[PDB]
Amino acid sequence: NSFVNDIFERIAGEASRLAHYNKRSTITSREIQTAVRLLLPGELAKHAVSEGTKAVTKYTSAK
């Protein structure tokens, strides 16, 4: 439970900043994705990007 909340806060925090730096009002799947590349080590980031991309695609096809 700690772990999920920890990484939730990290990704959401970086995402928040990404958007802020680029004068955007909206956090999209693209801010989450960048946040992840920045925050996760090499292999973990690739798999995490892969799973996130797969989940969004599946969702948009099933809307």
Binding site: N1, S2, F3, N5, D6
Partner: protein, 82 residues
């Protein structure tokens, strides 16, 4: 006896900790030095914990007060309601 509960951090407890950190041989001067360090650690952590307590207007320090303190100190802790 003991307005200094810091002495209740026994030489043995200090040896055990040092063992788990892979320390084999220990100078006599370590146990008092370790107590010196442990106090500064708890001072810094409890200070911030108690600030979180005062701010919430409570007279009871919570696990969350400590968790928030430890994170602020860059010593994030999992398993106490993170």
């Amino acid at each position: 006896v003991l307005r200094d509960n810091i002495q209740g951090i026994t030489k043995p407890a200090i040896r055990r900790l040092a063992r788990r950190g892979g320390v084999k041989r220990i100078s006599g001067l370590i146990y008092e030095e370790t107590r010196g360090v442990l106090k500064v650690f708890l001072e810094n952590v409890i200070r911030d914990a108690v600030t979180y307590t005062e701010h919430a207007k409570r007279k009871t320090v919570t696990a969350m007060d400590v968790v928030y303190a430890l994170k602020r100190q860059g010593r994030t802790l999992y398993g106490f309601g993170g």
